[PDB]
From TrEMBL, chains A, B, C, D:
Belongs to the phycobiliprotein family. It is found in: Cellular thylakoid membrane; Membrane. The lineage of its organism: Bacteria, Bacillati, Cyanobacteriota, Cyanophyceae, Gloeobacterales. This is Allophycocyanin alpha subunit. Keywords: Antenna complex, Bile pigment, Chromophore, Electron transport, Membrane, Photosynthesis, Phycobilisome, Thylakoid, Transport. The gene is apcA. It is a peripheral membrane protein. (2R,3E)-phycocyanobilin binds at residues 80, 82-83. It comes from Gloeobacter violaceus (strain ATCC 29082 / PCC 7421).
From TrEMBL, chains E, F, G:
This is Allophycocyanin beta subunit. It holds the Pfam family Phycobilisome. It comes from Gloeobacter violaceus (strain ATCC 29082 / PCC 7421). Keywords: Antenna complex, Bile pigment, Chromophore, Electron transport, Membrane, Methylation, Photosynthesis, Phycobilisome, Thylakoid, Transport. The modification N4-methylasparagine is found at residue 71. (2R,3E)-phycocyanobilin 1 binds at residues 62, 66, 71, 74, 76, 81. (2R,3E)-phycocyanobilin 2 binds at residues 76-77, 81, 84. It is a peripheral membrane protein. InterPro entries: Allophycocyanin_b (IPR006245), Globin-like_sf (IPR009050), Phycobilisome_asu/bsu (IPR012128), Phycobilisome_asu/bsu_sf (IPR038719). The gene is apcB. GO terms for biological process: photosynthesis.
From TrEMBL, chain H:
One of its GO terms (biological process) is photosynthesis. Keywords: Antenna complex, Membrane, Photosynthesis, Phycobilisome, Thylakoid. The gene is apcC. Its main location: membrane. SMART domains: CpcD. Pfam families: CpcD. This is Phycobilisome 7.8 kDa linker polypeptide, allophycocyanin-associated, core.
TrEMBL record, chain I:
Belongs to the phycobilisome linker protein family. It comes from the Bacteria. It comes from Gloeobacter violaceus (strain ATCC 29082 / PCC 7421). The chain holds residues 12 to 60 of 729 of the full protein. This is Glr2806 protein. It is found in: Cellular thylakoid membrane.
Amino acid sequence: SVLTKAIVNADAEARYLSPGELDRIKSFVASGERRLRIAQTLTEARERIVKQAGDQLFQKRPDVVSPGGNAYGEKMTALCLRDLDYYLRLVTYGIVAGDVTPIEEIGIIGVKEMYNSLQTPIPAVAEGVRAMKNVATSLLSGDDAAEAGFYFDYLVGAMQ
Amino acid sequence: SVLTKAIVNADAEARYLSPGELDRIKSFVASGERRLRIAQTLTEARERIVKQAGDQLFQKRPDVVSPGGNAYGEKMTALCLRDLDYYLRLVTYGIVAGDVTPIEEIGIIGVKEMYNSLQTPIPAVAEGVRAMKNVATSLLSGDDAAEAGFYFDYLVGAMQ
Amino acid sequence: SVLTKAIVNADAEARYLSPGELDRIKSFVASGERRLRIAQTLTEARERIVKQAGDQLFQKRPDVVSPGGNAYGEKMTALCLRDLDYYLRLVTYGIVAGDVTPIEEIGIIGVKEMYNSLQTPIPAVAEGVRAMKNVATSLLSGDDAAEAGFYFDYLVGAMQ
Amino acid sequence: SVLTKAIVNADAEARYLSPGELDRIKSFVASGERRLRIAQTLTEARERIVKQAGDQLFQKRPDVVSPGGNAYGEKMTALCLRDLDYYLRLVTYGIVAGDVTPIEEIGIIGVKEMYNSLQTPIPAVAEGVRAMKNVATSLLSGDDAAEAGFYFDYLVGAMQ
Amino acid sequence: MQDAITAVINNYDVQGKYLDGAALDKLKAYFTTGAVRVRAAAVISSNATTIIKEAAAKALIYSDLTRPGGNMYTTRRYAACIRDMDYFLRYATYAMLAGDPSILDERVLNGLKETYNSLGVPIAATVGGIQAMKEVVGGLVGPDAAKEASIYFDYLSSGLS
Amino acid sequence: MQDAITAVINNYDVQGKYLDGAALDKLKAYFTTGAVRVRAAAVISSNATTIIKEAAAKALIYSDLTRPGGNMYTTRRYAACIRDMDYFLRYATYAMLAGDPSILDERVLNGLKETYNSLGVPIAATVGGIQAMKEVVGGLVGPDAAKEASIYFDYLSSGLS
Amino acid sequence: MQDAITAVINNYDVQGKYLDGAALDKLKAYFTTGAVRVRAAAVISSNATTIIKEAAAKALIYSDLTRPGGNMYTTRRYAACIRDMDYFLRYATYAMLAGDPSILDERVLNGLKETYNSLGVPIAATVGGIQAMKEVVGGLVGPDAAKEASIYFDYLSSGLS
Amino acid sequence: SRYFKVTACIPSLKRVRTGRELQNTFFTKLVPYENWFTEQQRIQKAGGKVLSVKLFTGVQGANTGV
Amino acid sequence: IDSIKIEDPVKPGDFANFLDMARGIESRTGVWSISYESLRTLGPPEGGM
Ligand SMILES: *[C@H](C)[C@H]1/C(=C/c2[nH]c(/C=C3N=C(/C=C4\NC(=O)C(CC)=C4C)C(C)=C\3CCC(=O)O)c(CCC(=O)O)c2C)NC(=O)[C@@H]1C
Ligand SMILES: *[C@H](C)[C@H]1/C(=C/c2[nH]c(/C=C3N=C(/C=C4\NC(=O)C(CC)=C4C)C(C)=C\3CCC(=O)O)c(CCC(=O)O)c2C)NC(=O)[C@@H]1C
Ligand SMILES: *[C@H](C)[C@H]1/C(=C/c2[nH]c(/C=C3N=C(/C=C4\NC(=O)C(CC)=C4C)C(C)=C\3CCC(=O)O)c(CCC(=O)O)c2C)NC(=O)[C@@H]1C
Ligand SMILES: *[C@H](C)[C@H]1/C(=C/c2[nH]c(/C=C3N=C(/C=C4\NC(=O)C(CC)=C4C)C(C)=C\3CCC(=O)O)c(CCC(=O)O)c2C)NC(=O)[C@@H]1C
Ligand SMILES: *[C@H](C)[C@H]1/C(=C/c2[nH]c(/C=C3N=C(/C=C4\NC(=O)C(CC)=C4C)C(C)=C\3CCC(=O)O)c(CCC(=O)O)c2C)NC(=O)[C@@H]1C
């Protein structure tokens, strides 16, 4: 969260929270109500977002849904969608927290190593997240979509 | 090389070379003549080995030579063959050195990062090297093939 | 042993054993039968080797067997011979191991400090080991003697 | 010297000199005049001290002046005397300094290594210094001799 | 660590005995086995990543552990589990070459139970994963090698449990 | 560092050339001398202390250097000088095994001159000491090895001068 | 480091002057630009890997550098080069947010030439790679952002050369 | 005590590091005399080159005060 | 003065393998019909020049 990050920086400096750091906390608490609304919207539309994003991803990369590809077969295709759902859930948590710390601990640390064992291609995963962003953006208001975009972009950046 | 490695370990301990280390040097110089012959065989058959291995790899994995795949197109396919040729040359250097030190500096360090930028799939590359081993083994005598196999195996392990 | 040393270096690198390191193990297991024979020969002739070496050492250095000298007197002379026997036993262990690692813990680490307390002169001890080598070499076959020489030389180097 | 040592300790503490440290300096400067007299006496009698000490040392250790021994032969015997003279000069410097720091840099650091190359026995050298002390003590007044003794003792301690 | 050859030497050194024929026979036994072991070790190293993948598929993944709340849930924990698997495989290979289980006790087994208990890692599942690796390894190495390989895997599993 | 074998490999790698007959001949030349070098190295290591004593006696001590005002006056500086002698001997032995002088450049000659210049260490005497070691070694190693050993000592001396 | 806001403050502090309207106008200018810069930075971070790939394709790869005997030859060197490219991109993004080139001088530029000269890294090629990145970045960020982005890339290039 | 001023350039040839390593790579520094011999060796084993050495503090060929 | 070798059956028989040298049928879609020496100088994949 924003709070966690601020405290951690202060602890390292061994200081009480700076006026600037306090101001950042104030801004976050003001924004919180809007953030909660954005998260709720995405939660409601989750099933649709995952499904639509999956389709776009499979259109972008035929290979993943092909005999060679990892996604090939019903079970595998489901698992690939399950993963997209997991990432969407993480994004919602991120939006309410105001930071990617929640996202990062659950999903971005060790992700390369996990996917490499599975043999899933990381760039395709990133494409799926990009796809999810496009679907999500359409449902969201323009201002809301920008906020949501940052968190989606972070995921894409973290695994590419 | 064997020599380099022995000296380096001694230098770290700041000691003269151990009786065991000296023995290993003696063994290696005796082996050297045989090793040179093995390397020469592979060098002569190199054009064939690369070509045949490329064949097999593309047969094993249609995808790499497909519109989605990196290898797709003539230029790309040539580059993939060039890569195989590079790795074969490295293996020959390794056999005469008696160690993977030569191989490792030129080909195994930073390889993941290089291929990730290119977006080439690493497991396919490993398959290509496996393919090359099978071709090479057929040309080599059984005893020679075993020696050559170790060096090929190291590459496959490193590119994983 | 050869094995121990190889494993330890790999563990430090946190890697599986290199092709070259594996080859060295293969060579060592082939050598082992010959090594066992060499060790057995020395063990059988041990009593003779020690006695002859003692005599040569005392002839080479009057001082040790003189009232000033540490070796002077029956008890002291026995102890000096006992030490020579200990070093011979260590050499045999080394030959079968193919490395001085076993020898080194039992005999070469702290040796200077031990002898300095006793006030025994270190260079004389080294001479005794050289003496032992000459006797041992004569009993051994030329090829066997070379192998045995290295281990004897290591001892002489350590006590210097 | 006493002065150097006190300043160095203060500099490490990054402080001006402590009352106790200042007192030690005061005591030393009072002692200084007496110390200079003690040094002068030893300097005058130096040739005699070295000669007498040499004789005692050769009496104590016949071996050193024997064909095996390092001291054997005129040149070698001269060198052994020269060494004794060097150590006596060092002791005089130490007495006036009130500290062994001067002595230590010139004579005690690296002494073992130097003698080991030469193959001279270090314990014999120590005996020669002890011998020198006995001669020096007889020439000195009892109180003066005690002061001089400490410096002689330090030498014996440093190489032993 | 200690290997078969050194183990004999050490036992004779505490006795102070020179090496004897009986001792020589034990050493001789190791030397025959040795060539086979070297070949097995090379096989394992080349196929190491695959071995871990197969073993995870057999036991760990598609399970409650991977599902949310499970100890292998989250990428961080998944990655740590496959890292530990790799360690066990590497050390078992070292032990097989050495011909001695001691190295496993010194480097892998020491403190593992206590660490796992504090972490909350489930030991039983881990043991299951080790057993899975053994089966996969057995296939790759071939039967003669497999018997030798199996004992070290079993030694790890028993230690953990 | 590089040895004979890696020197050839590196030279071909920059061209991207597979090893050819010319290359193979150079490698063969090394392999045939190898056994001799190993024997020489063992001789030097066992006699290392003696070699340094003899070399100092012949070239450094019993002189003005060891006497007050000289650079090897004081136990501290005598000890430092024979410490340096020991490294030169050890590194020359490494070079002789390797069959390449590169290690001498990388790990002896580099920054030695600058250090020596600041200290004021007398170069001619040092070179004299290296040359003295060379003469001593030649005796011990024998005909097989003497020529080979000598070139590395010469390489060190020419680097300083 | 220094940012645009702090740069104004520092200039007034050396004068001892309280902040004045003219100073305020410079600060105000930064504040309008700021929103655009933040958007640009997010674009760059998301597309960072792509930017480097495209820029390498344009200048570095399929060249003599990649071919044997070139600085970017060998996997280790290839990887190091794309690592440096990533550094330049990241620092330029930092500078663009800051609105000041100081950070580039303080971290990237300081000691780089000397290090490069010892390594043998070719400066001209590196500069070429930076210029290539700029063009790619320009497209992604859009025109208004591109002008701001360009100056920092140019600053890096001039420093290196 | 004597002190050396030393410049060196060190490459990372075993691994590729993401964090900024420029400070490690080119490092002018002051080294106590008693530490320098070890520090020189370390730079050489890494395959760094020692660009310059000067004795900052201390007098050349001083028997005492060293 | 014997070449020896030829230990595995020299020919499986008409039915197995044979026509091994297919290489050189159409354009090098595959690997055959690409020059081994051309590799030394590949050039850019775009190859705009
Ligand atoms: C879909 C975009 C891509 C794809 C996915 C895919 N994943 C698996 C298997 C697993 N995926 C995970 C992932 C997670 N666990 C976590 O903790 C997180 C973060 C919260 C993630 C995202 C896991 C643990 C598994 C292992 C199996 C299990 O869940 O128990 C597969 C199938 C496995 C296989 O390799 O066959 C697939 C297909 N595959 C692609 O290529 C798509 C681009
Ligand atoms: C006499 C007590 C013992 C003895 C002495 C001995 N010394 C040498 C040779 C040298 N001794 C020194 C010593 C010093 N040089 C210094 O700078 C200092 C510190 C101030 C000392 C004490 C040196 C440098 C030498 C080298 C030769 C030279 O004089 O330049 C010898 C001869 C060595 C040889 O191997 O021939 C001897 C005999 N030896 C004994 O046995 C006595 C117990
Ligand atoms: C002996 C033949 C001559 C001699 C030696 C001498 N050396 C020093 C001091 C140093 N020597 C080194 C050199 C090295 N650094 C390296 O990396 C290597 C390669 C392994 C070497 C050989 C260094 C670093 C020092 C300074 C630090 C230290 O003492 O360890 C001295 C001391 C000089 C002083 O004034 O303190 C001496 C005397 N000088 C002679 O007179 C001989 C001709
Ligand atoms: C073939 C098995 C697979 C494949 C290969 C492939 N490689 C490239 C492009 C490059 N490959 C290299 C690799 C090396 N440079 C080195 O220094 C070494 C070590 C000695 C190697 C292995 C390089 C540098 C390039 C970049 C281009 C260049 O060399 O100038 C491609 C081209 C793709 C692209 O440019 O994007 C391909 C296709 N691709 C596959 O999918 C096969 C499995
Ligand atoms: C790529 C465009 C070109 C290229 C680069 C290249 N660089 C190195 C080695 C190093 N690069 C740096 C540079 C930096 N480190 C930093 O901290 C910073 C500032 C943030 C920079 C810019 C450093 C210090 C090194 C040395 C160690 C390291 O890896 O960091 C190499 C490798 C050279 C070698 O042999 O070590 C290369 C290849 N070279 C090219 O040819 C491209 C044009």
